[PDB]
């Protein structure tokens, strides 16, 4: 139904455990996201840090998505023809961590979180291919 079609789509192959379309302009809000997971809770403050002009404090400070503490690996969110930020969660004591890609479109952020062991390059390519589709449609 509407944007939920995109989530359901991202999630179908079993390789991911969370996904989300988030409107970043004006008043940032989640458009669609997996229920009872992480990205569903993303705040507009968090969204402002992902897209704000400071591209370097979040290296040393880290950043949260939905209050989940994350570590940035590559930032090219604002770079033409790249459009991605790659992160990995941080956990306590041997508890698994997960790769995440956020891709920027004209109006949206597409977020995606792999299951344990899923490689960052696959999440990157999946997230980025979905974003493209959106971007092709003026989104």
């Amino acid at each position: 139904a509407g944007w939920n079609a995109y989530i359901d789509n991202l999630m179908a192959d079993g390789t991911c455990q969370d996904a989300a379309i988030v409107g970043y302009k004006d008043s940032p809000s989640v458009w669609a996201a997996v229920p009872g997971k992480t990205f569903v809770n993303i705040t507009p403050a968090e969204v402002g840090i992902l897209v704000g002009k400071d591209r370097s404090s979040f290296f040393v400070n880290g950043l949260t998505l939905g209050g989940q503490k994350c570590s940035v690996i590559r930032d090219s969110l604002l770079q033409d023809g790249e459009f991605t930020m790659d992160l990995r969660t941080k956990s306590t004591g041997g508890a698994p961590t997960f790769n995440i890609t956020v891709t920027m479109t004209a109006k949206t952020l597409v977020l995606l979180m792999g299951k344990e062991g899923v490689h960052g390059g696959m999440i990157n390519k999946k997230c980025y291919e979905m974003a493209s589709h959106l971007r092709r449609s003026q989104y």
């Binding site: 370097s56 290296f59 040393v60 400070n61 880290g62 503490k69 570590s71 940035v72 690996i73 590559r74 930032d75 023809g81 790249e82 991605t84 790659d86 990995r88 941080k90 961590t97 790769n99 062991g117 899923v118 490689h119 960052g120 390059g121 696959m122 990157n124 390519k125 980025y128």
Partner: protein
């Protein structure tokens, strides 16, 4: 059956994944035919690679297509890879998946070109490109930590999180084994001997590798060398001159820590390492400190570990805990780590497919390999 191909500036190391060691190590050189007219001379070919190019040095113009880790001429490289698959491993590359390595910070265009050649030219059925340092970290069986990699041309500090290199915090130092070799040369000349030529550089390189060491306290070892022959060693030249090295033994690697010995304004390897850590996420500084791993030829110096240990201790927050790891096999780390990664079932899930290429083309490398 996957292939591992580690491309240094000087030696190409190729093998099969899961093997303990490369099944082929050969100089990374292309020779073309040098003035001599087609047939008589000997080289009728317009291309010659590696050891046969070495043995045929005369009547050939010898090139290294790799420089400081970065590919410099794509025409030559192509023949290294051509020769790697065909003459050295005796394989049909269209039949094997391959893991390539690349330098930290390998530029965009280069990553893309590496990808194009593998697919359009060798018709690789699948490929992946991995940061050399990252592979050295797996060879030591960790996934978090910072790699200090030092070869002959360049030194890099690469912090790594769960197997992901952190490019904003990678530092490059233009100071490796060559500058050391040249420095040793210089101080042996000053002492009384006379190494200045290309033939003599190789003698000195060999002295470096054979007798140099890092001193725990630099002032103190100087004072011990000044008051005793206890540290002097003798060395047997290609002719028959036997010579004596004292001071020089540990004054030479000392330039890794004090680059003003070479007229350089840089900080040394200890401080370059700390500066990388300080650029990482406060939450993993702890694990980098206790997982600092050395790799490459120039890290084989006895005492370099203890000294790194000591120098990091001083720079770091005082109740942090430091650990230098220096694999007894740390010369061959990069190809080993490669063999570890590319031999897993998992690997199928990371690589770039030939069809993925047909679909997305060369820029797929920026999405998939990191």
């Amino acid at each position: 059956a996957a292939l591992v191909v580690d491309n240094g500036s000087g030696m190409c190391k190729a093998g099969f994944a899961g093997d303990d060691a490369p099944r082929a190590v050969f100089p990374s050189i292309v020779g073309r035919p040098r003035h001599q007219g087609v047939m008589v001379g000997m080289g009728q070919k317009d291309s010659y690679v590696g050891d046969e190019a070495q043995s045929k040095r005369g009547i050939l113009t010898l090139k290294y297509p790799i420089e400081h880790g970065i590919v410099t001429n794509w025409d030559d490289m192509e023949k290294i890879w051509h020769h790697t698959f065909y003459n050295e491993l005796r394989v049909a590359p269209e039949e094997h998946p391959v893991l390539l390595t690349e330098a930290p910070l390998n530029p965009k265009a280069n990553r893309e070109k590496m990808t194009q050649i593998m697919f359009e030219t060798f018709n690789t059925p699948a490929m992946y490109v991995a940061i050399q340092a990252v592979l050295s970290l797996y060879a030591s069986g960790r996934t978090t930590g910072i790699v200090m990699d030092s070869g002959d041309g360049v030194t890099h500090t690469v912090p790594i999180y769960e197997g992901y290199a952190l490019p904003h915090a990678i530092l490059r130092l233009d100071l490796a084994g060559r500058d050391l070799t040249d420095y040793l040369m210089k101080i042996l000349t000053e002492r009384g001997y006379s190494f200045t030529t290309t033939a003599e550089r190789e003698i000195v390189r060999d002295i470096k590798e054979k007798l140099c060491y890092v001193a725990l306290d630099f002032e103190q070892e100087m004072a011990t060398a000044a008051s005793s022959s206890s540290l002097e060693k003798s060395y047997e030249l290609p002719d028959g001159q036997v010579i004596t090295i004292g001071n020089e033994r540990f004054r030479c690697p000392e330039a890794l820590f004090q680059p003003s010995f070479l007229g350089m304004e840089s900080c040394g390897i200890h401080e370059t390492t700390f500066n990388s850590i300080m650029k990482c996420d406060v939450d993993i500084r702890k694990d980098l400190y206790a997982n600092t791993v050395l790799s490459g030829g120039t890290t084989m110096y006895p005492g370099i570990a203890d000294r790194m240990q000591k120098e990091i201790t001083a720079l770091a927050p005082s109740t942090m805990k430091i650990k230098i790891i220096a694999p007894p096999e740390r010369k061959y780390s990069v190809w080993i780590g490669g063999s570890i990664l590319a031999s897993l079932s998992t690997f199928q899930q990371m690589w770039i497919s030939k069809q993925e290429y047909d679909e997305s083309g060369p820029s797929i490398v920026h999405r998939k390999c990191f």
